[PDB]
Design a protein around this ligand. Structure first.
Ligand code: HEM
Ligand code: HEM
Ligand code: HEM
Ligand code: HEM
Lengths: 141, 146, 141, 146
């Protein structure tokens, strides 16, 4: 679903993020790899060390994809079609892993947006990241 | 949940700084708000219709603080979370019938609240040590299901 | 998603079920209550004993709802709007419980459709029941 | 996983009837087919593109049978599934890095396969006892994560 108030929330909060979004992405990935070692399995070719240019570079790709979804929040399945195929059909990513990354993203946003991470925006943001994950696993369903 | 000396170091430096009268109430309000099915266990507490209803509920802050008490006990007792949680597990499983997945969720919104409160202090390694504690408490609690 | 082959599969298999669907529903509910006692929590006013006319009666309601979804498999969110509201917004049903009921439904169909529960139809049926659950929790998201 | 005498009665009468050369291969093929992410751990086995590719793969039937061997061991050892599963848990957690949720899924497709094979014999009570065994094996396997 995602109500009108959620859409406002997510847009405001991505707004605050602004030109840091890729930096927050690479931090989120780093949070996931350390916390949930099972996710590493999917990144055998990456170096996952603290300074990895690979983690940095991928963190931007993720941030851009989420930015595209915010921008196209009323037609996400289309916006994200390609990524759906890549993730569900090509890489076969275990869906449980989308919860873990959304969780690490929420933590990063809390670490960075003291004022804007209210309970209400937290709920919206969660609802937004579960919608993204439904679309990216939706080839499975 | 074993925890290397540097993890217990990370976990312990933060935990001491944690406003214990507050953080508990923030985790639980956020649980109810973000995952509203959990509200069914708390309908007694009264008015939970809005997020501001929830965060300002004195019963929410009072129960959050009990909950935080139990975490401090697990922190105190990593080497026997089982023994430590027997009566609570009994309570949540047998009596209340809470799905253990909601233990995981409570732990994860606790990690968000800690991130929210500590900002950059709450680095990825510190999070990773906290995700271990959180998971082990969730597991001791589900023990009676097991 | 649900491909064209899935739609064919689900329709064929619901076809075999035919006039037993309500009977299979009440069996499925009985399977869930015994196996997953935590789900009982939501049915304090029911008698959940083997012969309960209540379980029988509710098992038909569930079977009818799933029948409506099969019949309207390309526009499920609408078909199921009302039930969405009831389940996500009124009863606040924990979403994990939809996996448990879908699992008990699959078991019942395997118990009854020896020939038609092939691997392929099993996959379809799973995909169909997860789509139903996405729609019934979608008010949450 | 305690199991009352009538549950072990139910579990045990069925298990003895179970075609052990077959049922294992059916559970695993069905795992790969219904939950295709799991295929990533089995790409060695070769051609898994269609369901008929999968069910007729001789490597699928050979591994399913190993797996079933391990269940029979847990059935043999309910009172210490932990001890019984130490080396497997070590394997699946440490070495392979399997998410424990997939242990739950494997158990549940095993229950479908048993239902499929035993029909009405596989009553709701018999299922409920099997969901206990299944969960306890999934838990012993995840022990090393714990
Ligand atoms: C929030 C949902 C996610 C989004 C926004 C997302 C987005 C992306 C993007 C934009 C790419 C690049 C695709 C391309 O242009 O070729 C990518 C690749 C990939 N993603 Fe995701 N991803 C997400 C979740 C996941 C998760 C949960 C996993 C695994 C734990 C994962 C595993 C992969 C793999 C391994 C690739 C290929 C890596 C490579 O070869 O460079 N993704 N992801
Ligand atoms: C995993 C972390 C959890 C911890 C540490 C925990 C801890 C506690 C504590 C200390 C109490 C107070 C018990 C007493 O008065 O002695 C309690 C009670 C309660 N909790 Fe939890 N709990 C957890 C998760 C949950 C979840 C997710 C729910 C469901 C949404 C839940 C529902 C309740 C209820 C209903 C009570 C009151 C029981 C009664 O008064 O009969 N708890 N919990
Ligand atoms: C496969 C998805 C499900 C479908 C098809 C479904 C369908 C139904 C239907 C048709 C009703 C009657 C609504 C009305 O006409 O007023 C109902 C009611 C209800 N359902 Fe579901 N349901 C499903 C899943 C769940 C689950 C997983 C739970 C809980 C474990 C649940 C809990 C409830 C409750 C408690 C009610 C009200 C019971 C009563 O007061 O009669 N449902 N369900
Ligand atoms: C919960 C039930 C499971 C049981 C009882 C179990 C049991 C077994 C057994 C007995 C073996 C043979 C090991 C040996 O040769 O000694 C094995 C290996 C393996 N299983 Fe599992 N397993 C389970 C679930 C899973 C799941 C869900 C996956 C992931 C989809 C997985 C992936 C594998 C792989 C990759 C191996 C081969 C390891 C290697 O050769 O290095 N297993 N398992």
């Amino acid at each position: 679903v995602l109500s009108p108030a959620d859409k406002t929330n997510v847009k405001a909060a991505w707004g605050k993020v602004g030109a840091h979004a890729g930096e927050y992405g690479a931090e989120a990935l780093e949070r996931m790899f350390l916390s949930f070692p099972t996710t590493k399995t999917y990144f055998p070719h990456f170096d996952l060390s603290h300074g990895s240019a690979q983690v940095k570079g991928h963190g931007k790709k993720v941030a851009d994809a989420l930015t595209n979804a915010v921008a196209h929040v009323d037609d996400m399945p289309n916006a994200l079609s390609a990524l759906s195929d890549l993730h569900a059909h090509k890489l076969r990513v275990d869906p449980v892993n989308f919860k873990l990354l959304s969780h690490c993203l929420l933590v990063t946003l809390a670490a960075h947006l003291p004022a804007e991470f209210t309970p209400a925006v937290h709920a919206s943001l969660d609802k937004f990241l579960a919608s993204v994950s439904t679309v990216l696993t939706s080839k499975y369903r | 949940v074993h925890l290397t000396p540097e993890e217990k170091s990370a976990v312990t430096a933060l935990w001491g700084k944690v406003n214990v009268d507050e953080v508990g109430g923030e985790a639980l309000g956020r649980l109810l708000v973000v995952y509203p099915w959990t509200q069914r266990f708390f309908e007694s507490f009264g008015d939970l219709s809005t997020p501001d209803a929830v965060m300002g509920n004195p019963k929410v802050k009072a129960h959050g603080k009990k909950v935080l008490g139990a975490f401090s006990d697990g922190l105190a007792h990593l080497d026997n979370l089982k023994g430590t949680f027997a009566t609570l597990s009994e309570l949540h499983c047998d009596k209340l019938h809470v799905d253990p997945e909601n233990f995981r969720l409570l732990g994860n919104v606790l990690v968000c609240v800690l991130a929210h409160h500590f900002g950059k202090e709450f680095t990825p390694p510190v999070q990773a040590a906290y995700q271990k504690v959180v998971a082990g408490v969730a597991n001791a609690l589900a023990h009676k299901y097991h």
